[PDB]
């Protein structure tokens, strides 16, 4: 499907550290190379090295392998959003439930949206996941610490983006419409969703949902979606052919002072004229969700598997 800016990394030693880069286009480049997932693993699970060797982000595994949104290199996964500061992919704890369905065996990182957040599981050096996903057993094949991208599993068809916040009263309204669309559901990922006399054990649950920036997600059955292209600065990346992403200084200058190269859309809305070149990130645009008579621009929208208990009467 191809990357946004940067072709897949070819790392040299597992012990090289990863710099913090201030520039937007540089961060996008780290994301194309799964530098951010590598960093997550080093921070949380005693991992040494990198994931994404050669293939980069375009070669990661998705659990519904039929995945629409990865066909667009520019739509952001939860890990992608975490590197840009829009949300935190937390380390899993014992109460977080691994969903059945994915092929966990041999994965070194996986991540799923939960009802109230985003949760990830990583493996230490020389290890990879058992088939239940519950433990990391030894795996001599991962001993180099420079692992291919199919060891990274992203659960769900998910798109994340900058949101326009909504007041708390609007959230409580959306929460009410969700409760009436799913009367049969008691808990989702351990969070009370409806009041129930008696409940079944937790079951796999595929559902459409949106993150609108409050205490938990809004799950949805009947809803409409629409894409608007807005040509703001985050929709463009800046590079210099044969050298990778431009620096932070060069990028701000290209996007303020209209004095760099560009494609049609970047010149049309920003102005142009050795120098850097900026062009359009490949995506349908920003997603807007219509639910319960409202329109909302969520932080994340997607379809994805969670755990839920159903009512037994």
């Amino acid at each position, epitope marked *: 499907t191809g990357p946004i800016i940067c072709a897949g990394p070819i790392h040299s030693n597992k012990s090289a550290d990863i710099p913090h880069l201030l520039g937007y286009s540089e961060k996008i480049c780290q994301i194309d190379r799964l530098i951010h997932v590598s960093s997550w693993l080093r921070n949380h699970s005693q991992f040494q090295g990198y994931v994404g060797q050669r293939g980069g982000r375009s070669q990661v595994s998705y659990y519904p392998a039929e995945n629409s949104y990865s066909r667009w290199s520019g739509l952001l996964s939860p890990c992608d959003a975490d590197w840009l500061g829009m949300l935190v992919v937390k380390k899993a704890k014992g109460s977080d439930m691994i969903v059945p369905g994915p092929s966990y065996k041999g994965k070194v990182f996986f991540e799923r949206p939960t009802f109230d957040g985003y949760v990830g599981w990583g493996c230490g050096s020389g290890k990879s996941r058992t088939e239940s996903g*519950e*433990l990391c057993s*030894s795996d001599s094949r991962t001993s180099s610490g420079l692992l291919p991208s199919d060891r990274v599993l992203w659960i769900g068809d998910v798109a994340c983006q900058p949101m326009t916040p909504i007041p708390e009263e609007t959230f409580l309204e959306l929460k009410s419409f969700s409760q009436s669309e799913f009367p049969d559901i008691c808990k989702i990922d351990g969070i009370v969703f409806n009041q129930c006399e008696g409940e079944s054990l937790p079951q796999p649950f595929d559902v459409a949902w949106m993150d609108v920036g409050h205490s938990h997600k809004i799950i949805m059955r009947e809803h409409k979606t629409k894409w608007v292209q807005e040509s703001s600065s985050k929709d463009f990346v800046c590079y210099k052919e044969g050298t990778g992403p431009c620096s932070e200084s060069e990028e701000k200058t290209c996007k303020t002072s209209g004095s760099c190269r560009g494609d049609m859309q970047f010149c049309k809305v920003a102005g142009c004229e050795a120098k850097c070149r900026c062009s359009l990130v490949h995506k349908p645009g920003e997603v807007v969700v219509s639910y319960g008579g409202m329109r909302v621009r969520p932080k994340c929208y997607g379809f994805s598997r969670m755990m839920a208990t159903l009512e037994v009467s």
Partner: antibody, heavy 120, light 111 residues
């Protein structure tokens, strides 16, 4: 590297209390539960309790509920164990250990141990 | 609580020979394809050191003379070829449920 560092040996009088510390470094403190284990001299290892440093939630061995109290300080990466109403039956080496729930579900890093002698 | 019974309580093995230690649980510690059983080595004055987690996984930097096997309730720690540094007390420990429990331990002496 993960490392856990316990406070030094302790001499305390019967009926008194004692507080032991365990300082974690080399990883993000609130990611993993911290366990506490008792080992009387020559005897076997016994579980006392654990604490989730992210939110303070605790679980105790029934044998030590009311005897031991577990706390942490997030800002300084330290876990604490308070022992009260000391008798001679509380003299032992006490360990802290980090559990890697989704890696090995084992206690893969331990502190060096804190010797506690209860006598007058 | 899940009670763990180690045997023998004490065992003597000649250098270069094989040591075989047993642990029996009073209930299964298996769940969805893994066995939640760990083995620790403890020398006098030091903390336990993790050798084997989940029945058969060697912790990093543990020599391949150590191996573990078993499933459900019956587990084995093998040391072959036994060496001088292997003199210690070996503990099993189940991680299936709260409360964690430990076996009584097996002291390995060298002949």
């Amino acid at each position: 590297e993960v490392q856990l560092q316990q406070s030094g040996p302790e001499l305390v009088k019967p009926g008194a209390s004692v507080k032991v510390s365990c300082k974690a470094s080399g990883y993000s403190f609130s990611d993993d539960n911290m366990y506490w284990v008792k080992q009387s001299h020559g005897k076997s290892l016994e579980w006392i309790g654990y604490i989730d440093p992210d939110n303070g939630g605790t679980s105790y061995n029934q044998k030590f509920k009311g005897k031991a109290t577990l706390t942490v300080d997030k800002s300084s990466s330290t876990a604490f164990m308070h022992l009260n109403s000391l008798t001679s039956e509380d003299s032992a080496v006490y360990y802290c250990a980090r559990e890697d729930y989704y890696g090995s579900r084992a206690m893969d890093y331990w502190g060096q141990g804190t010797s506690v002698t209860v006598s007058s | 609580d899940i009670v763990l019974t180690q045997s023998p309580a004490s065992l003597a093995v000649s250098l270069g020979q094989r040591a075989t230690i047993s642990c029996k649980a009073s209930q299964s510690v298996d769940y969805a394809g893994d066995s939640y059983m760990n083995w620790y080595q403890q020398k006098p004055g030091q903390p336990p050191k993790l050798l084997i987690y989940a029945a058969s996984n060697l912790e990093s930097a543990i020599p391949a003379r150590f191996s573990g096997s078993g499933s459900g309730t019956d587990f084995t720690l093998n040391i072959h070829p036994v060496q001088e540094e292997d003199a210690a007390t070996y503990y099993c420990q189940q991680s299936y449920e709260d409360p964690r429990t430990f076996g009584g331990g097996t002291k390995l002496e060298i002949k």
